[PDB]
């Protein structure tokens, strides 16, 4: 029932493999749909004047033993991103950050979801009730670990990590 989406990942100029993700559309349908549509790029051009699509965007902030963060396809540095909806409200906090390899929304406070997201690499319970958890990695866990190793304490990647393709 739940959509399954993927990112193909390159680290530097080198294809790393694919992260395959389940989105919890059954419990978090608005948040899952935004992410699904940003993987396919099916909504076309956005309000920022760029494609509403993760393809070509990077994991711009990577912290080892914490998480990997991406989805800023408008500014590429954490200051941008946009939802298919034009920010949206925190849908619910049904799921918690109780495991690595969960997908959750980055934000800039309450009810500011756009396109940025993270994949956890540890439990992040201090984020419960503040970031909407909306899926998990099904396959490609080792790719997430390879991305994570490219992180830094200041979050700056030591090698670029690109979503070279995305979709269903």
């Amino acid at each position: 029932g739940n959509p399954v989406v993927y990112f193909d990942i390159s680290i530097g100029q080198t294809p790393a493999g694919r992260i395959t993700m389940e989105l919890f559309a059954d419990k978090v349908p608005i948040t899952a749909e935004n992410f699904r549509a940003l993987c396919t790029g099916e909504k076309g051009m956005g309000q920022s004047g760029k494609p509403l699509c993760y393809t070509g965007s990077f994991f711009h902030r990577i912290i080892p033993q914490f998480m990997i963060q991406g989805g800023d396809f408008t500014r590429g540095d954490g200051t941008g991103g946009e939802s298919i909806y034009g920010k949206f409200r925190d849908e619910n906090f049904v799921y918690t950050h109780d495991a690595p390899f969960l997908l959750s929304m980055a934000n800039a406070g309450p009810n500011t979801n756009g396109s940025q997201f993270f994949i956890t690499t540890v439990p992040c319970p201090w984020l419960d009730g503040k970031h909407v958890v909306f899926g998990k990695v099904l396959e490609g866990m080792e790719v997430v670990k390879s991305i994570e190793k490219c992180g830094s304490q200041n979050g700056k990647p030591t090698k670029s990590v690109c979503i070279t393709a995305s979709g269903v």
Binding site: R61, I63, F66, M67, Q69, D72, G78, T79, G81, S104, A106, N107, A108, G109, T112, G114, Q116, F118, C124, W126, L127, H131, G155
Partner: peptide, 11 residues
């Protein structure tokens, strides 16, 4: 600290 924000990364 360990947050996941979009614009002003905090401690």
């Amino acid at each position: 600290x360990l947050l996941v924000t979009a614009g002003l990364v905090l401690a």
